Amino acid sequence: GSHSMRYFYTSVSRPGRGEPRFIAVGYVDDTQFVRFDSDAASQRMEPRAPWIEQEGPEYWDQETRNVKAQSQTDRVDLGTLRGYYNQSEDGSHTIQIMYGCDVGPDGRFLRGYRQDAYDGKDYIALNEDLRSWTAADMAAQITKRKWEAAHAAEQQRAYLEGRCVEWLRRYLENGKETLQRTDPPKTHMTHHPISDHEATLRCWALGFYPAEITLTWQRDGEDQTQDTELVETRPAGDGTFQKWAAVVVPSGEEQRYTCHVQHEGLPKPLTLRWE
């Protein structure tokens, strides 16, 4: 299976206090493995997964230095962007940065990406060729000019095709007991009557990893979208994920509906019916 590594960076500007907050998390696939907070006392990148703890001083040292540099770049650009939008100096504003790289089971580099946002809207993106940018506003056009005239995509593509994949391969070997495992969904189905003639059938998937899963309700073997309810795949805090889907069915017909479950850890899709 393919495996990714993505880093997430939030900077929000705090006018009253006067020095913005900076939160950075690192995920391998769906398993966060590091973190950095600007108001926390530690002021260093902190392991959040056991298999990265083995890396020594130099790794943590270099990572903290680079992330602090990113924090200061974000602060300055928050200042520049409040100008590009002619915005109040009173208000608080967010800059978000996500970037990462995807390698396949062969281990070979598959793709790279780097997207930047302001105030929850797309600001600028690295295009799929890693040498063109797609700005989303006129202010972004200003940024592209400076970036295009600085050949920043070169540095982003050197990192994305370079250190990013090498290190994700190192991490995937360091934690292969947990990063390449596939805990299959544990499924079960509940029955809650709602009227004398209506009942709800709810279909449960628990304890699965990775977080990708597909729950489907089919009435008489045809996919049912009306009278369905599916909830957002949620974490458990043990490193697995949970999901349920549900349908309101008439009375006496509970056996004309079927829950279909697709996930990696199931080699053939599973079917569930109220017995």
């Binding site: 880093y7 770049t73 940024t143 990192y159």
Partner: peptide, 10 residues
């Protein structure tokens, strides 16, 4: 790891 030195201004 994280992206290395950049200093890329917006």
């Amino acid at each position: 790891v994280v992206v290395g030195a950049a200093g890329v201004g917006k």
